[PDB]
C-alpha cells in the first residue's frame, strides 16, 4: 500500500502524498519570516553554484504577488512557478471585482485552497511547496505573516522557518524571539532574520537575501552593501562573545 | 534458468544414450525408434 495515489486514505489515516510533499520542501532553500510591530521581514537563502550562473537575469526566491503582498518559497523550483502565477491572477481579480487591495488573510486562503484542490483530486499531485506569504493589510498597520503547507492548511505564525534544515533554525528562533516584545525598529528585525540564516549558510552574505515589506504598500529589496554591513556587526559581536565566557570563567 | 532443477539432473543420462546409438551407423540393419510423452521437457535428442 497505500501511497500509490492521493485517493487511498490508509488505515493510519494519512494521505501520503501530502506527507511526502513535506520531505520535498527540504530540497529547497531556507526562508525565514519574523514580524516586528511596523514591518515584516521576509528573507531567504540564495543558492550560489558557480560564477557562470548570474543573479541578475536569474530568479530570486522572493517574488512580489502585488505591491503589498510578498512571497518566499521552498520546494521544487518548477512547481512554485505556477503556484505563484495562479495566486497572482487572483490577487488582481480581487480589484477587478471589488476594487480593493487584496486582504492578506483572503490571499493566503486562496493559495492554500489551490494546494487543497490538488490534494483532494487524484488527477494531479499537489505543488510540493510550502510558502511564507508576508504583507500588510489594505489600510491597517497590523503586520501579517501566514504560512501555507502542501496540505492546504494555513496558519498564522509570528515567526516560522521552512526550507532546508528548518528545524535547526526554528529552535534558535523560538528562543530569541518574543510575542511579549517583537523588534520595534526594522533594523533589529532585519538582523534577526540575518542571525537565523547565518547558521545554515555558514560563509557568505551573498547567500542571504533580505527584502522588507512595510505598511502603505512599500516593498523594498535590500542591497548587498547593507546585508554585508549587517553580517559584519553580528560577526564582531559573536567574536567578542567568545572572549567574555573565557574571562567570566576565569573571573568566578 | 528458472525451471525445475529436477529435469536438469536426469538430463545427463540421455546424453550418454544419444552418443551410444551412433555405433550402429551406417549398417541399417539395427534401428532405433523413440517416443516422447511430455512437452515439458525439450530433449537434447531433438537438437542433434
Amino acid at each position: 500500500g497505500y501511497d500509490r495515489a492521493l485517493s487511498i486514505f490508509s488505515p493510519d489515516g494519512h494521505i501520503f502524498q501530502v506527507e511526502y510533499a513535506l520531505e520535498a520542501v527540504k530540497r529547497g532553500t531556507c526562508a525565514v519570516g519574523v514580524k516586528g510591530k511596523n514591518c515584516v521581514v521576509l528573507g531567504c537563502e540564495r543558492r550560489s553554484t558557480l560564477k557562470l550562473q548570474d543573479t541578475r537575469i536569474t530568479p530570486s526566491k522572493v517574488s512580489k504577488i502585488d505591491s503589498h503582498v510578498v512571497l518566499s518559497f521552498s520546494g521544487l523550483n518548477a512547481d512554485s512557478r505556477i503556484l505563484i502565477e495562479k495566486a497572482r491572477v487572483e490577487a488582481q481579480s480581487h480589484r477587478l471585482t471589488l476594487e480593493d487591495p487584496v486582504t492578506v488573510e483572503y490571499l493566503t486562503r486562496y493559495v492554500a485552497g489551490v494546494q487543497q484542490r490538488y490534494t483532494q483530486s487524484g488527477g494531479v499531485r499537489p505543488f510540493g511547496v510550502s510558502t511564507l506569504i508576508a504583507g500588510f493589510d489594505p489600510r491597517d498597520d497590523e503586520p501579517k505573516l501566514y504560512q501555507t503547507e502542501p496540505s492546504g492548511i494555513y496558519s498564522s505564525w509570528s515567526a516560522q522557518t521552512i526550507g532546508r534544515n528548518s528545524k535547526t533554525v526554528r529552535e534558535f528562533l523560538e528562543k530569541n524571539y518574543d510575542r511579549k516584545e517583537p523588534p520595534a525598529t526594522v533594523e533589529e528585525c532585519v538582523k534577526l532574520t540575518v542571525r537565523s540564516l547565518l547558521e545554515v549558510v555558514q560563509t557568505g552574505a551573498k547567500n542571504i537575501e533580505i527584502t522588507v515589506v512595510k505598511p502603505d504598500s512599500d516593498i523594498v529589496a535590500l542591497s548587498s552593501e547593507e546585508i554585508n554591513q549587517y553580517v559584519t556587526q553580528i560577526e564582531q559581536e559573536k567574536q567578542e562573545q567568545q572572549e567574555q565566557d573565557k574571562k567570566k570563567k576565569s573571573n568566578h | 534458468s528458472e525451471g525445475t532443477s529436477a529435469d536438469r539432473e536426469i538430463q545427463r543420462t540421455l546424453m550418454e544414450l544419444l552418443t551410444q546409438m551412433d555405433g550402429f551407423d551406417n549398417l541399417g540393419q539395427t534401428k532405433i525408434i523413440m517416443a516422447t510423452n511430455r512437452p515439458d521437457t525439450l530433449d537434447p535428442a531433438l537438437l542433434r
Binding site: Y2, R4, I153, Y177 | -
Partner: protein, 245 residues
Amino acid sequence: SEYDRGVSTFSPEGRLFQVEYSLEAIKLGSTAIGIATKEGVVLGVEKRATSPLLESDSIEKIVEIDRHIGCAMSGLTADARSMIEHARTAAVTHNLYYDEDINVESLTQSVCDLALRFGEGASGEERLMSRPFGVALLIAGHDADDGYQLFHAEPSGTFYRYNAKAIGSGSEGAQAELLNEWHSSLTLKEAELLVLKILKQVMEEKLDENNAQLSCITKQDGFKIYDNEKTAELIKELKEKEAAE
C-alpha cells in the same frame, strides 16, 4: 487487506474500507466537545501549540456558519475548508429562498450529501470528489420548532443526534465521563464549566485559555465566539470548584 485500495470495491464483510478509515482521521485531530443544554449548546475545542510561535487565536477550529448554526471541527483542516464552505452557502441560500433560519437537521443533511461523493461517476448525484472527506463536524444551533439540537456530521454521510458528543483524540475519555455527566437540569454556565472539567483530563498539555476556545449558541446572544479574557475567567472558576471538593 487486499480489498481496500479502491472506494467502490468491497470487502468480505460488506463495508467500504476507505469510508471506515476516514473515521480514524478524526482521532488524529485535537479534542472537541459539545454539550447541548436547554439554554444553548457550548462548543469547546482544544488547540495545540506546536511552537509557542503558532499564534493560537489565528487558528480557527470554531467557525461561524450563520447567525444560528455554528460548527466546531476536528481532523484535517485541508478537508475542512471545502466541507465548511458548502454549509456556509447552505444557510445563506436557505434564508434567501424561505427567509427562515435553516433547520439544524436539514443543514446537516446538506453537509452529509456532499460527504456521499466518493466515486468518480455514478447514477444520480454525479460524483466529483475523489475520496471521502477526512473531517467530522459537531453542528450546533437552534431552530424555532425543535429548540436546541446538537448533531455530529460524519464524513461517512451519516448523522446522529446527540445530547453530547466528543470527537478528536480525547473522544473516548470524554465520552466515558459524559455518560456519568449529562442531565436534563443543567444550565449554560454549568455547561461551560462542564466542558472544561472534561477537557483538562483529555488534554496532553495543561488547561490555559490560549489552548481553549469555547463558544455558545444562545437565542439572545446568537452565535458568540469568546475571547481569551473571557475564557481565562472561566478557567479560574473551574479550579475554584475543584478546590472545595
